[PDB]
Structures are given as structure tokens and as C-alpha cells.
């Protein structure tokens, strides 16, 4: 499941959309609208664990974010959400330019960034795999030491 949230400057969720059909039931039970970003994502992860999407094997969540040191506050919230839930995380900063390219092909900002990155490093990742492979699977395929890493 892929979910897109819109937040205001105080990190209140003002809009929420399922980026695929199997995100709809999780959004309905989570009801993230008007909630704090931390609360919204924490319940989304809680529901995901209940429904079976998050488990000991696939224990990685992929976040991506774009503005319009503010993003650092957002990034800290995303780290807290994952650590407090006991799941590993990858956070991929994005841009409005890339978000629109992702929307145009019905991909999340995170999967789009990862799909583009794999192509540039010569990894065999077709469009269907980029959209449907599990988070832990696509990260194992793309993160092979062929591009720069930093913290």
C-alpha cells in the first residue's frame, strides 16, 4: 500500500489520498485527516501491522517528502514514527518537479526516486517491479554500492 499525505506548516494532515487501491481500506480505518503527521503515520503503520502488510520479514517502510531547515523537522518526525514502531526506514527527499513526474506515472515519490536510481546504475528494474515489488525487495536491488551515500 502507498499513501500520500498533505500537511500544513504545523504538520497537521490536511489531505490524504490512496496512491493505489489497496491503500483505501487502510486510509478508511486510519482516518488521518486533520491529525498530527506523527499520529497519522503511527496509526497507518499500526493498521498495516494488523492487516499483515508489516511483519518481521518485511520490516522496512519507505517515506518520501517534498516541501512546497523545515524538512529536517519533517524528517525527524518520520524517523520517530518508524523507530517507535520498531520498523526500519528509508527516507528519500524529493522535489515538486519529481513529485509531478511521479504522479504522472502513478508512483509515489519514493518508488519513483528508487526506479530512476536503479536505471541510472544499470539495475534491471522494469516499471512493474518498481510499482509492485516490496519495499525490502526493491531496496536490496537498488542499494548495491554504485552511488553516493551520506548522512
Amino acid at each position: 500500500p502507498s499513501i500520500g499525505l498533505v500537511i500544513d506548516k504545523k504538520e497537521k494532515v490536511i489531505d490524504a489520498k490512496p496512491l493505489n487501491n489497496d491503500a483505501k481500506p487502510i486510509l478508511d480505518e486510519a482516518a488521518p485527516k486533520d491529525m498530527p503527521l506523527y499520529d497519522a503515520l503511527s496509526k497507518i503503520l499500526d493498521i498495516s501491522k494488523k492487516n499483515g502488510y508489516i511483519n518481521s520479514a518485511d520490516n522496512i517502510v519507505l517515506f518520501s517528502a517534498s516541501i512546497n531547515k523545515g524538512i529536517q523537522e519533517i524528517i525527524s518526525t518520520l524517523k520517530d514514527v518508524a523507530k517507535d514502531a520498531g520498523v526500519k526506514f528509508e527516507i528519500i527527499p524529493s522535489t515538486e518537479e519529481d513529485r509531478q513526474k511521479a504522479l504522472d506515472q502513478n508512483l509515489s515519490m519514493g518508488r519513483y526516486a528508487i526506479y530512476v536510481k536503479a536505471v541510472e546504475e544499470g539495475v534491471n528494474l522494469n516499471l512493474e517491479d518498481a510499482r509492485n515489488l516490496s519495499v525490502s525487495e526493491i531496496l536490496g536491488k537498488v542499494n548495491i554500492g554504485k552511488f553516493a551515500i551520506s548522512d
Binding site: 500500500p1 500520500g4 517515506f63 518520501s64 517528502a65 516541501i67 523545515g70
Partner: peptide, 10 residues
């Protein structure tokens, strides 16, 4: 408005 956040699970 201020920021967009996507989350991918499974």
C-alpha cells in the same frame, strides 16, 4: 500546502 509526504508499505 506546506509539504507532501508519501509512505510505501509492503
Amino acid at each position: 500546502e506546506y509539504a507532501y509526504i508519501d509512505v510505501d508499505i509492503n
